[PDB]
Symmetry: D2
Subunit: 368 residues, 4 copies
Amino acid sequence: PLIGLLFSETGVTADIERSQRYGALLAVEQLNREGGVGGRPIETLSQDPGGDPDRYRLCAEDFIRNRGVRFLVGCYMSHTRKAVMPVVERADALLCYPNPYEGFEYSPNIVYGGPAPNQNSAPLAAYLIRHYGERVVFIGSDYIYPRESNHVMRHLYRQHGGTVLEEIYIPLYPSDDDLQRAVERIYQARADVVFSTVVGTGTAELYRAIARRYGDGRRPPIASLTTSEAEVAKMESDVAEGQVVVAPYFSSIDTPASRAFVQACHGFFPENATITAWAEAAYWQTLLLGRAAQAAGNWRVEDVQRHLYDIDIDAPQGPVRVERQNNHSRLSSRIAEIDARGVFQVRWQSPEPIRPDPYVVVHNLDDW
Amino acid sequence: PLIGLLFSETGVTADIERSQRYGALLAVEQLNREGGVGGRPIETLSQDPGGDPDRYRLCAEDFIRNRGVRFLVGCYMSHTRKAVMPVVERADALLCYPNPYEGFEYSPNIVYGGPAPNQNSAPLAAYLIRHYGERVVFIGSDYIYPRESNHVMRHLYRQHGGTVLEEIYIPLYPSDDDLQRAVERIYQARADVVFSTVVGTGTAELYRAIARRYGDGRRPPIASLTTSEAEVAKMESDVAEGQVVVAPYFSSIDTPASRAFVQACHGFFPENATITAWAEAAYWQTLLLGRAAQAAGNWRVEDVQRHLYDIDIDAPQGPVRVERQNNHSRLSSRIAEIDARGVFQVRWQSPEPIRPDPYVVVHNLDDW
Amino acid sequence: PLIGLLFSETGVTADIERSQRYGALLAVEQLNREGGVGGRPIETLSQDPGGDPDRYRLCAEDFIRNRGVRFLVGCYMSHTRKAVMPVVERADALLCYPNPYEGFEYSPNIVYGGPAPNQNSAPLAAYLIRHYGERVVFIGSDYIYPRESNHVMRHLYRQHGGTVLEEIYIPLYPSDDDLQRAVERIYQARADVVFSTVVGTGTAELYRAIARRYGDGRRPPIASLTTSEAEVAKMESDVAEGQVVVAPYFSSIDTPASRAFVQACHGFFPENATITAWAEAAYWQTLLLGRAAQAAGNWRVEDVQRHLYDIDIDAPQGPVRVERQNNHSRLSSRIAEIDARGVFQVRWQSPEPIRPDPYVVVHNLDDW
Amino acid sequence: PLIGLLFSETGVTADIERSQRYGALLAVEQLNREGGVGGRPIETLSQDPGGDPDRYRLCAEDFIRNRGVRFLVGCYMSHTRKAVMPVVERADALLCYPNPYEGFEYSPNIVYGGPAPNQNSAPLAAYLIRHYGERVVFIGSDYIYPRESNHVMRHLYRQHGGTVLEEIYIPLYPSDDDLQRAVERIYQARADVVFSTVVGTGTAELYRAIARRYGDGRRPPIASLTTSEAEVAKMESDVAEGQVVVAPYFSSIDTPASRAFVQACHGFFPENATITAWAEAAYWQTLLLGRAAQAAGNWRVEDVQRHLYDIDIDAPQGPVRVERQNNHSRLSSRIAEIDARGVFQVRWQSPEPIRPDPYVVVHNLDDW
């Protein structure tokens, strides 16, 4: 019962992936310190892909073709997930992708653990418009997630009569010049909201930059689908506060399962690992992978797969399940606001988990 | 009533796009020489993008932003369609894409006229396996269509217990060396079928090359989703014969609507324009665009859109319609075999048009 | 005596390459209608690469590997020249590159006919600084020529205590948005000169755009190393006038060889082919290729090569020669100013042809 | 007196760059434990770019724009050096590049410490031909160094009547499939020598792979310009032995300066840092940077630059100097053979350091 961890230690998204890695190691701990899985202990392998799509392929190639791994939890950025996809499909292995993403994808061998666009962007567009205004400017890192993410957010804004003013993209490893030239565009745009699809290290940099270009008084909020406790941990409180984010989970949610997860993360995560929605997603996904295997009583992927769609888990965010119709998960959807002291303060929460709909057709979407 | 034609005149796919352009010009002729559309004549614009995704953007930018065009029929290769997509969405225009493609896409402003993978690959995989063998090797041009096309064909082969031996990719503008090194791989692979996703000019080159590496006697057939009368028109009869292709239409199908279309193409297409399935698709799509506008009595896109999904057309391939749930079309699916004298000889035809399912999940697919 | 013409007919730089193609066809005419070359007539082949580096490779592959061509005149953009380079080197063929370019290259099989940076940028930097100011902003198409061109121009400006304010790059096939966002940067920069390395079709677009952002009164001149009668032919007189350009030749230079070339171009070039410095370069280079072959009395490349470096030609721009130490040419260097009626008005001309120095080390450069 | 170290800790070339980093830290130690530089201690900064050209830019951006660094030693792969180049030129800083590379480059702000092609490939081609045969096959990582490196090696082989059979390229992060498909080509090629321009981690993998495809008996040697004690440290003795490499230095050379450097490296380098030619180059370059600054008595780059070209250093490889005509160094050139027990056994050594000639014109090259 060997699992392969594909989470960067270094690179643009190293902070969030490290939270993710730990969320997964915690799950392993608990499944192990519960007599493991059929009296044998589950053992994990880790390599650092450094956020590079080719190193993810290589690492997933290595794990599968040389250490005989058939179960993987990892990948953050979508181009990184796609590079590993063919590899898992070729070797019949299973990968759990505990992250938010643009949609319009299906792999029989990939379990989608974070929200598809109808699960985060759909609710979020409505909140932003019906609470802050209809003018918005899009700023994203320059890769496939941001671009496809904005594609549907554009559709979403048009549905609700809002207006996309500008669509700005910056390198994943951006220069201050790049940052300064985009912030200026975002300033002069005069929108009511800033929809950020900037990931990793440029997140904090971008938010600070925006703050600073606006000085004293009213500046639009920065809404994002990725910004977590990971990236907020790198910003000044004034810079961070007031910022919006949708995700299935927040370290501060009221409830016994969250606190259970929280007080356990605190007793296991290294100081440079924060507690985020993505660490929550890698935790539940890892549990489920073990639970299914106990139920099958084997570490065969077919035997474990079978049981994957029959196990509902009482995850820190609420009850989750994995639809077999498209391999995505029914997830909670919370829209939290950041404190003047940098805690996520939930403002809205869907009345029940949202079923996944990866092929996003706005008009056939439920109107929040 | 101004329509923008986005079809290459030069470049890798110039032959097929030229057939497409003419299929569309013919439709215009007929809608015009039928009192036009509200007594004004429909007028078309053409520019040659040369198969380059950036020149397609530029051309669609030009047509929309300077000649006030809101209706377009064109694009062949998927990366070319995607480059134009944002442009049509930004300006609220409509583009008809009369071509086969990989799926997993949605735009409110794009009408998908050629088959999605459940419409051609699904039936085709079954035919190839249940008629030629289960061993197959994939050879494609190196861009997004071939790669995503093979992704689902891999799933398809695994469903039916077949085997993908090798996945080979060659540049869109390939050198003989490139061609020779891939053909060798395809030879040594010893498959029962060659699934080609090679497009434009390298098509004929590839097929000839394969033929020639096999000399006298048994060589697997070459099945493709794109090869049409366009590319077969460039190959020797022995090279062409025996080759498989799935598409909604073939210039040689028995029926009064085909012959009607055929004997009219013959009286309008220049000698360097052949009659293909893709010219059939650009013809029906153009008709429908006019018909809807007559019905709306206006060249507004909202007014024409409305009526788009209510007009079933009796296209040369049979009855077609455009589902409003995902903007794709219900299409016929024929699997023809090439003559020793190079005519497509239909061997199989779906009992009714296949409804489109762009989000391809093999297990939930109908088993042919 | 077969020569291969590699000049785009369509695409970003089609206008200039068409002038180039004709400059070369004229040379052929004259060498032919002079009893040819050893009583056999020289025959040319042309294909349209459309400005795409891969199609140039393919075309040069085709010409060499299938029509047995060993002599080529063509290529414009540097990435296009580099794609063909390996091909000519592999097959021992000779290519004449009649164009300006960034330097830092050597091929035994390539004859460099247009200026290296010490031949155009060096003189030009001095003129611009010692005549207009020391503040400059760089705007270029986004490919290897513009970027390497600015690299040395930066060195050059630092030598003479000038200042590079901004370095802006736009796609080869740019959107008005792209154009508008760069012009704005160039406006707000407040430089004394605009150094353009924008090529093909975006040239006119850029110059017009700049003009228009400045309206009435003082706007810095636009200096370029490529802008020719080709691209000026697409601009309004007010837009064109006052603009600077360095090149070895201008259709309007005083002299019997220029007029000879001019009055002959006029009697041979189609109306959509202008008379430029680059058509002058393809003409002299083609002559020399013939002359050497007469002298060798053969169309062998070794035999013709030998004589290449011994033939000084009295080209329309003055006496030229091809140094065997690095395959580049000693060329004239004129800095012309554009008329209010759009004629290039030479303002400066080097006292003798400048010997080529492709490995540009500013400090060891002659100070103009 | 602050110096910025730009050497990967993780990624494709992490092993060699780590040897390089240590070679530089050692130099600092010695200049410091020699009363430093003007009684203040020289202090270094390090960041891990992970072999990614964008992270090198970012890191060099960070070091310069935020920690006020004006002196840098680092970069390995040429695309990584080029990404940092504009940055150092823009901020007037100095970078020492202690590595072998393709040539055809000049920056006033870059000190070239490893050999240009006339310094390693030129001698080496002669040795290989006049000692092993004239048939050769080229295998390289797919980036600018390998490709430009082979460009000149092709010229070199043609000069000496040798033959380039095949030119094969593999990703920097290659799959076994990629490795297996290239080794096969290299096997079937039947050359006398394998010229490798494969760098980092795929080096060992490639050599092992080749060995293993050849089994028992005669297989051509593997000559390289980069393979060092770093990459040989990852291979079996039988795999490593017999292999050729040219570089200015080898940890095993007879001489008091080498042993001095060696016995000091041993007392400072961590166990995962080997002693290589590139660690020798970063050591001498760092010394020189200090020495010049002592001489100028200041850490100004102009003041230090002045003295850079006047200080000849008695480096472990012999006497070195930095030509001010092109910023490259006069270096020793040794061709060593690997032991059956994996020590580099020098077989040839140039009679004096070779002066650098970055603009490589084979015919004007000295014939070894």
